[PDB]
Design an enzyme around this catalytic site. Structure first.
Site, PDB file in Angstrom:
ATOM      1  N   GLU C 251       0.911  -1.085   0.031  1.00 16.89           N
ATOM      2  CA  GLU C 251      -0.116  -0.188   0.052  1.00 16.89           C
ATOM      3  C   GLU C 251       0.962   1.169  -0.060  1.00 16.89           C
ATOM      4  OE1 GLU C 251      -2.020  -1.055   3.761  1.00 16.89           O
ATOM      5  OE2 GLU C 251      -3.701  -2.132   2.699  1.00 16.89           O
ATOM      6  N   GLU C 464      -5.640  -5.334  -0.063  1.00 15.66           N
ATOM      7  CA  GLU C 464      -6.314  -5.942   1.198  1.00 15.66           C
ATOM      8  C   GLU C 464      -7.610  -5.436   1.513  1.00 15.66           C
ATOM      9  OE1 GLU C 464      -3.331  -6.212   4.585  1.00 15.66           O
ATOM     10  OE2 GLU C 464      -1.764  -6.222   2.963  1.00 15.66           O
TER      11      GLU C 464
END
Ligand SMILES: NC(=O)c1ccc[n+]([C@@H]2O[C@H](COP(=O)([O-])OP(=O)(O)OC[C@H]3O[C@@H](n4cnc5c(N)ncnc54)[C@H](O)[C@@H]3O)[C@@H](O)[C@H]2O)c1
Ligand SMILES: NC(=O)c1ccc[n+]([C@@H]2O[C@H](COP(=O)([O-])OP(=O)(O)OC[C@H]3O[C@@H](n4cnc5c(N)ncnc54)[C@H](O)[C@@H]3O)[C@@H](O)[C@H]2O)c1
Ligand SMILES: O=C/C=C/C=C(/O)C(=O)O
Ligand SMILES: O=C/C=C/C=C(/O)C(=O)O
Ligand code: NA
Ligand code: NA
Ligand code: NA
Ligand code: NA
Lengths: 483, 483, 483, 483
Positions: C251, C464
């Site tokens: 991320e 995710e």
């Protein structure tokens, strides 16, 4: 002791009561107020109204937390729940301690968890004008759920319907069995003490025909009726709701078979069939009343089972190594003993049991019977086709896999079957050809609450369990946005 | 022309017959052989036996390829099917060409594909001995599906039931409406020529009460009944199957609303209500017979819709710019004309229509009515609350959003609703609060065949569409292996 | 001697320590023991071994319960976690109370619950010999997960990785940011006190390159590496794990836009962009550094935003109406100031801020900057294209819808975007055209833990959130049984 | 015979060409034009622009129909695709006609179908102000997908990547193995004749390092790299894309085991291992090169296998009952014979095989080796640990279940395993403990295209198959609407 209705956040009595009888010894445990039409109506209206109150404004996370608080509440009065269940039914204490009450706690916790992780669908589509559209689904409360439950696992089955109804944001009017009203009454106290808003959970006591059961069933204010009981009662209830075309979910009888193939582990099969025939004194819808054993091990099986059956301690719920308690009631022992006789007439050999034990104490005024095993009957005998719901099985030999499958399936019922075999191919090949909702291979009544749990043919209508309860207790609505 | 039953692979006649009438000019199209209790019995028996033959042995893949061929065979005969639906119902040719027949084709293709891509579930669990267990679900045919369908979108609603039934591997006995039997009979021919094995699909012609319909509904050999029709008919059928506790799936009436908010795109809303009130001459369960329009635009909306309704061409199915054909039959027209009078008696202003157009040719012997708009009735009027199923809407003003929502929801039906607004919040705030199965925003009857598609309250029992159809036409069975 | 590593169930120190500085005043908060290569190896090995210990043997239900005790244990020390987070970062106390700590607790709870409700798949197939086969999938732990997290939402982002890791049965070796190590250290004490078995959770302190981060990344014993941080660090890590082909989940940065159309609620949009640009002093990956406003409202929007920004209280975490704390460190503060200058060199008009506020007290030794707003830069200016990660936005006008969509998408990043409009069509039509992982309409950073939550292009690798975390942190294995 | 690139709707040659050699007889089959960096660039750029053209405007259902058109195109040239696979590789004609070509067709069909049935998710949530919000996910193309495939199942594995790429609306630049370029070139022809828009599918020929493959891998314009081949090349490629942080999906080597327990059906197990070791001359990643057999049946197993392996016909692809063709090339055969020598040096008993057969015709100019069985090596031997990728297996005895599980899992790879046992518990207990992606019980390489299909550890990075391919080849984006 006295058991009151619980309507709109208030315990209330009625213009009449019936007795609740302890079946260990015929004595009286409590008076139970019978709800009348007017009181039923007052229950449904309050559950209607509770949907537009604070219950209906809770987030899904806050509702889930309250339901967990209901479960915590039961754990905090655990030994009282045990005592109430035992008293009503005669269930051995140990089994109320490890199966009935813990399961009830897990019913609330599991459905609260499902309601938190559950989501719906998004569908994108093209349109003539090239701008497209979206359809999405939303999950809403179905409305007011009528719950009617049976006496054999009183709290376990009452909570199996009530937990997912509440999890899905519905409100509930629930009518437990006349025979086992106690654990339910205690639940109403747990609800109250937990802060469950008035009108959300309503408990009404009564009977079926001409009592609370029937009035609930005919009330136009409910949106659905979930029921567990006799197949004939299902048909009745299905007729009663037909004019409102209410959503119905039924779990009904079975005449379940166990099957033991030559290559089974014989000891484990004997033990497994013991449990499956005589657990809760055979008063589970899931119990095996017909057993088929391959011819090559049939005599050995019947001997082994006869022995283990005679070692069963039939006594006081709290007696040292007790295995069985009585039937639920005298009326139900009258039906069971009546099958015991009908078996004889129809030609059965009694391998063991076949009547009632003798105590020379207060238990002789109870409702005990003996674990019975029959042999000799044909596939069309009434004692092999109709549900007895006592601690009984018939054992019959078979030769061929195809034959025994056909014999298992030659039934108007379709709830469960257990199959005993060590062979990989057989287990999967035979399982899928059995026309029932639940097959167990080398075990019985093993439970995972996410699974679909119900039967086919006369043994049910719809399915519950896991996402199937989420679907039944919710209204899915589709919203289409043109872009 | 003659229309035979199709039972066990053969087209067969009956001892009795009835007339199929073209509602455009009242003329005779065909004679149709009514099936008796006895033939219904043969169709069911044959459908049971077809389960144990070649059909029951096909792989999911081969089953699907055979269903794609059914679809190819309708396509190959596309214009004959178009001609059949037009003759029976009076529907404009272009509508049968663009909606009716392509949808019957896509219904088979959609469900074939859904059957190929569909799987079930695997649950793992711990056990007390540490060895664990598996529970897996499998998908079997439910058995024999009984299908009874209405006359308003004949091949479309008929295939919407038969396609998933067959894709899930069921066998079928299907009874189309007596008013529109032709496309179903042509479909039976496609089935035959595509090599569908005998007994898989059986077509029985007849009526309801004391006829083929009733008989199918009472036969104990069926596993389920799926039905689309009047709510009261649903109620009756639910009583009829209750003794067998058969799976039931119902799509029933509606009294659908459209709501037009102040920030609607007005011209697009007028066009949309025109379409939602008058498509297929208002003979669609989805149609809007109640219309709510914000007070600041009510007079302009009413005027605009009047104009557009008076431009609609009412005439032959193949006439130039035809928008609307007749009603299905003289009997249905009697029922509609009766509600037309009732509206005047209840105080309605007739904004337009309210009678029968006069043609001065053969169509005057047909079953035509005028598109009709009313104004001025109260929410209690029968005409505002009972399903008419004709080309009519009532238009009433509102001032407040919560107010309109309650007026939409104050109904015993809950099929569909359309809402018109350009505002992002409102679209999603309002839609979710409507108690119906289907909401459209800024359109109407935009379909995605993956969605759930059905209503709540008196408008339905269960749901079909996408995985809801696969759930309903399948038996989901659980297998538990102790490891 | 203040913040220790936790390896194989013991707190341990190291050969060297480094200073943890309070950004409010530049004072020493703690010495942190920097784990060396050998200690990183001891941690990986212990995590490896704990997979075979008691942790490996817990049922899913029991694992979940233990994770809920981790959550409970945080809740019980709620204010100590708040104090820790605040001390490291200078975050306002109310924000740590309402966002940071509660979210860390909910990360653990949500993933425990998903682990309990998740199931896998069952596929039936036909075979040439007519017996068939089954394929089913099972979920297993991947192995040892290496977790490397950033300093901006320390406990929130750390637990966002650690909770699903542990919930899926993995063990963990976790390296928090050097700038914010305290909350993760307290988490290890919670793990310890909850009786999480040794080796299951291991905490290593240190830096990136030539330190504990890098060593973890190169260790052949990990099965996966989950990372949050800068894009360039993501690339370095992807190279480091390449020889082992380890699973990766990144991320990374963004350069997020907000878009305000003429029909927005202007006061809500100003408030929205205020939060989106200046929350956590603009140190959130999701913050808006580029704002596009329709030309008819541009001047008004800019003037309203100026006022609101100059009403922000920049100060002490426990100071009365405080809205912003300092930046994380002097080092990060110099990077941001360097961009504030570059903004002026590149031609920007400084609408407000642009330097460091003057406190005349110990805050002058901390790492504060002012909330800053720019105007007049070109779309190719470095200040509009490179991530600054400070409390700063540039506002630019636009005219057409197509044009602004192109300017939003003209970026090597693709994390998030916010759109302000009251129009229904536009919301859905624009949102879908923006090439980012997360669009918010009429809000910002609104969070539902079930959703996929990450970015595209340079902003992410993999995904995710929800079932996406369950997929990443699980090994899915397919077992095929020939019947 | 000449094999061109296909870039931007056009076939094009190159500055350089290499030889494609038939491995049956070493003869030249074609010249293949190697693409250079400029041409790769040209491909990626066309593929980028193709996303904004007609291809991008297709509805899902139209995209799918067109992919069904591609599959029909292959079906229409079936035998030309058969001859092209066979000539490149030497695989038996019957394998090409029964596995290779049909699977390539079914890949395209399966994914087209899945593209049509697939939807996304809808999450409802509460907010502070009680108005709530909605999160929905949409499915978008990822971008340009770079595809690099191996030579062992040329068209099956190439289309296993291209098909889901196209189904999800991506555009593709694809590079087949230099050893097997023909079927892919014919696939370019089919694409073109099916009207696939220019730039949607681009084909580039060449090698890896310093050629088309590398250049693909380094191009900033791709969004993802899907790759099948050696583990080492996996690492190189993961490095090459690290600066771009591109999505990656790798299916890599294995050293797969087969395990035969004492209760196996021994003759079935012998045939199964024969098929798992020697199919495609052991050149499938799925082949078993390590076999463990219970001590009690080890000698009988090896004897039986020896006989069956000596009856294998090794020869021309259309020779009568041919079972094996040659290896792919002389270079691959050098590697395999290197391992044959190493095995002898490490102490193996050569049970059969171990050299090249003597044909006395053109087949002696090809790349044949004999099927080979070894006994007597230790678990640490290189021939038992490293992947050989020829027709070879080593057999070793074992005594205990837990021991043999540890021996199978003692490997840096984790692709597949096959297990032979008739015992129900064993199949499920043992299967779940093997650390691989794919276990077969009592069969091998039985395939259902809906399943996940990939390995763990060095055998894989990510997972494809069924919805795992839909996840990988799509961008899943979340949109949140504040209501
Ligand atoms: N899941 C299952 O499949 C399952 C499980 C356990 C027991 N059972 C069934 O439980 C039964 C035990 O109870 P029973 O014999 O008294 O069953 P029953 O059907 O007579 O009654 C059970 C419940 O239905 C109510 N009831 C009875 N008649 C009614 C009517 N006309 N309208 C509304 N409600 C009515 C009763 O008051 C009670 O609450 C067994 O016959 C067995 O078939 C089924
Ligand atoms: N969800 C998201 O997309 C997201 C969210 C928040 C923050 N971020 C990023 O957070 C960053 C915070 O700055 P930063 O300096 O902490 O970023 P960073 O990438 O330099 O550091 C992040 C973490 O990586 C470790 N690290 C650094 N170099 C490493 C190496 N070579 N090997 C292994 N580990 C290494 C650090 O020690 C730290 O724990 C911002 O720059 C922003 O881009 C991204
Ligand atoms: O439902 C009938 C028997 C049920 C046993 C259960 O555990 C259950 O229903 O939850
Ligand atoms: O079902 C009632 C109206 C249906 C229209 C449809 O398109 C459908 O049912 O499929
Ligand atoms: Na009692
Ligand atoms: Na007619
Ligand atoms: Na710090
Ligand atoms: Na070649």
């Amino acid at each position: 002791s006295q058991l009151l209705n619980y309507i709109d956040g208030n315990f209330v009595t009625s213009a009449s009561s019936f007795a609740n009888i302890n079946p260990v010894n015929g004595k009286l445990i409590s008076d139970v107020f019978e709800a009348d039409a007017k009181q039923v109506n007052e229950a449904v209206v309050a559950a209607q109204n509770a949907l537009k109150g604070p219950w209906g404004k809770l987030s899904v996370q806050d509702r889930a937390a309250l339901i967990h608080k209901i479960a915590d509440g039961i754990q905090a009065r655990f030994e009282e729940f045990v005592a109430a269940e035992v008293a009503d039914t005669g269930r051995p204490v140990h089994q109320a301690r490890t199966l009935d009450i813990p399961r009830a706690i897990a019913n609330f916790r599991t459905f609260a968890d499902l309601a938190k992780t559950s989501h719906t669908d998004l569908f994108e589509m093209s349109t003539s004008d090239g701008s497209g559209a979206l359809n999405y689904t939303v999950r809403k409360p179905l409305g007011v759920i009528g719950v009617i439950s049976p006496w054999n696992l009183p709290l376990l089955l009452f909570t199996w319907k009530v937990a997912p109804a509440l999890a899905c944001g519905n409100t509930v009017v629930a009518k437990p069995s006349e025979e086992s009203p106690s654990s339910a009454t205690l639940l109403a106290e747990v609800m109250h003490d937990a802060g469950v808003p008035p009108g959300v959970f309503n408990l009404i006591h009564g009977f079926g025909k001409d009592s609370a059961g029937e009035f609930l069933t005919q009330h136009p204010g409910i949106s659905a009726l979930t029921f567990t009981g006799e197949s004939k009662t299902g048909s009745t209830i299905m007729k009663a709701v037909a004019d409102g075309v209410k959503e119905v979910s039924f779990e009904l009888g079975g005449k379940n078979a166990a099957v033991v193939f030559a290559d089974a582990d014989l000891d484990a099969a004997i033990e497994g069939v013991l449990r499956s025939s005589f657990t809760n004194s055979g008063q589970v819808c899931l119990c095996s009343e017909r057993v088929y054993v391959h011819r090559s091990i049939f005599d050995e099986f019947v001997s082994g089972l006869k022995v283990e059956a005679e070692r069963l301690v039939v006594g006081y719920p709290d007696q040292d190594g007790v295995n069985m308690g009585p039937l639920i009631s005298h009326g139900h022992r009258d039906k069971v003993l009546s099958y015991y006789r009908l078996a004889v007439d129809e030609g059965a050999t009694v391998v063991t049991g076949g009547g009632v034990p003798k105590f020379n104490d207060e238990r002789d005024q109870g409702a005990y019977v003996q674990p019975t095993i029959w042999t000799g009957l044909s596939d069309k005998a009434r004692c092999v086709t109709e549900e007895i719901f006592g601690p009984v099985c018939h054992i019959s030999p078979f030769d061929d896999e195809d034959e025994v499958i056909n014999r298992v399936n030659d039934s108007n019922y379709g709830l469960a079957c257990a199959i005993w075999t060590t062979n990989l191919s057989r287990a999967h090949r035979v399982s899928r050809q059995i026309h029932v909702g639940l097959v167990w291979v080398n075990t019985w009544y093993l439970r995972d609450l996410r699974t679909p749990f119900g039967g086919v043919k006369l043994s049910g209508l719809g399915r519950e369990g896991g996402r199937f309860s989420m679907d039944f207790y919710s209204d899915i609505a589709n919203i289409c946005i043109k872009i």
